[PDB]
Ligand binder design. Structure first.
Ligand SMILES: *[C@@H](CC(=O)OCC)[C@H](C[C@@H]1CCNC1=O)NC(=O)[C@@H](CC(=O)[C@@H](NC(=O)c1cc(C)on1)C(C)C)Cc1ccc(F)cc1
Ligand SMILES: *[C@@H](CC(=O)OCC)[C@H](C[C@@H]1CCNC1=O)NC(=O)[C@@H](CC(=O)[C@@H](NC(=O)c1cc(C)on1)C(C)C)Cc1ccc(F)cc1
Lengths: 305, 305
């Protein structure tokens, strides 16, 4: 029993972590086959952060300016290409520990683990979600870029995120491993406001199923609701609308607990309108919205990798 | 910026994870050098759980009954010894990936990461604390025993916990890697009540420093308090007493933020007496007590491994 902010095991990503020094600035890179990926701001300093010209920087730069290190072994860069806001550094050697991997661009709502690193060495691992406004509530310091987020399927690591920036709001912004930023953010020290975040309704419901599975059942009421009426209330509390595709993704939790999704929606409707009155659900006094229906299943059923 | 339930990277523990089949029952084991450690209830079934006689079980059992597997490679047991409630299985081969390790018995209040595994394969990693009543709020299912908790220092993995049982209360109990149970628990299906848990005061204060470092500062008031008067109030709300050793462990956070510990104690005194009034601190509507002063430092300063 129990429910925790579970992250995927990080060993397979630990083996692919390098540090990348171009000039004085140093950051992290992902070493896959004979290419190292890393943010493209490794070729500019904080002096250039204001509004960098990345194309003049790499133009006037050779493969010797790039010093990749893997513990103690240094790597020799043979070519360097710029795919959007990421930098592909083709190196002579290929990482022996390159796992079965893939590059995916996740959607708002989906979760992923993060392996925070500095100087190409990993500090810790934690779980995050891509917010509806394409930000994440991470935990990063100076020298954390290159740190990546990922999902797993047995042995296929699905890289989905590379860390680039932190908005003055405390939130964080990044790209996929193809260099395209999530949301309307671009790597330069310019004021860019993220949209108004919203609560991930489907994830709140999956979290409520997890509570039921674990014994917390005081919030279950006797009612049902239509999908529209629920959405009418949720709309007031800045909750994302619940589509039928979300209802279908909860089918398994619904089937497993014997609680129809729309009855659970009725339980949540009351929680939003009346609050929790100082009670807790799975040890939290707030409604949690960073657990997907799959995250609950893999944790309450125990899928391994 | 940011603050998350950060866990240590799990790669080095992933490499030491095996599955151990004695009869039909299968669980997990820790493969270090030429010995595999695992709970001693692998030689008894649920039928025996009521009150097992572990010494008659291993007596009438040979090294062929023990089938250790490491992915696909099976291992050959040469000897088997019973150290308290753990089982030492001496095998012919030695784990090539055995990291610099050590076995420590942590104290109540200390935290550690957990790598939850099933069938010798890792599902996920999360962070826990040894409660003042020698339980932990984990996330374990059937077939999770053998799963271990640990801390790290650069490259020295400090194994501190192996998972054995779950009390009907939902909490969990285990042993150190020397087979001695934390608290008054013994591996048998017998009603055993844990003490009344308490809040880890020192950790709540460290968490409050972390909030200040991250911008949440509304709870800071203008007062100071004596150590005794604080303890008098904290005593009422089931908070552990704050010793001078705890005050000294907060010195660094105190020095870094410029807030004296006893003034922070005054801020917490108000939070307990008046509550938070629907506000949050680092995204939580409750006071969190599973972060040590070191856990904050390593995360807000960025120590790597
Ligand atoms: C990562 C860069 C690194 O590893 O080397 C240190 C310079 C760093 C992450 C943030 C640092 C502080 N905590 C973080 O999470 N990124 C940067 O320093 C970039 C600049 C910023 O992030 C600033 N914010 C903005 O520019 C901004 C963007 C928007 C839309 O609104 N404001 C904060 C530091 C204030 C620059 C950079 C440097 C090197 C890289 F590889 C990527 C990006
Ligand atoms: C781990 C055993 C395993 O991996 O194989 C499955 C039998 C398992 C962990 C719990 C299972 C359910 N969720 C868990 O976290 N441990 C057990 O099954 C042991 C029996 C129990 O834990 C029961 N609780 C008690 O016995 C108890 C103890 C006290 C002080 O109060 N109540 C729960 C299942 C109800 C038996 C066991 C089997 C194999 C092992 F290697 C260790 C322990």
């Amino acid at each position: 029993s129990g429910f925790r902010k579970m992250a995927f095991p990080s060993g397979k990503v630990e083996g692919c972590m390098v540090q990348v020094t171009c000039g004085t600035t140093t950051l992290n890179g992902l070493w896959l086959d004979d290419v190292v990926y890393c943010p493209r701001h490794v070729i500019c300093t904080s002096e250039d952060m204001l509004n960098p010209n990345y194309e003049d920087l790499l133009i006037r730069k050779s493969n010797h300016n790039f010093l990749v290190q893997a513990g103690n072994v240094q790597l020799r860069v043979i070519g360097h290409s710029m795919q959007n806001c990421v930098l592909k550094l083709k190196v002579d050697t290929a990482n022996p520990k390159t796992p079965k991997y893939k590059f995916v661009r996740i959607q708002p709502g989906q979760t992923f683990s993060v392996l925070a690193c500095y100087n190409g060495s990993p500090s810790g691992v934690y779980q995050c979600a891509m917010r509806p406004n394409f930000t994440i509530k991470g935990s990063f310091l100076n020298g954390s870029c290159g740190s990546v987020g990922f999902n797993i399927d047995y042995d296929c690591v699905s890289f989905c995120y590379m860390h680039h920036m932190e908005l003055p709001t405390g939130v964080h912004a990044g790209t996929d491993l193809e260099g395209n930023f999530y949301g309307p953010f671009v790597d330069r020290q310019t004021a860019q406001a993220a949209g108004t975040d919203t609560t991930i309704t489907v994830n709140v419901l999956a979290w409520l199923y997890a509570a039921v599975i674990n014994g917390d059942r005081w919030f279950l009421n006797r009612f049902t609701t239509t999908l529209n009426d629920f959405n009418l209330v949720a709309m007031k509390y800045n909750y994302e609308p619940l589509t039928q595709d979300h209802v279908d993704i909860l089918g398994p939790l619904s089937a497993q607990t014997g609680i129809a999704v729309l009855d659970m929606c009725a339980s949540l409707k009351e929680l939003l309108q009346n609050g929790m009155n100082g009670r807790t659900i799975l040890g939290s006094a707030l409604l949690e919205d960073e657990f997907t229906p799959f995250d609950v299943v893999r944790q309450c059923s125990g899928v391994t990798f």
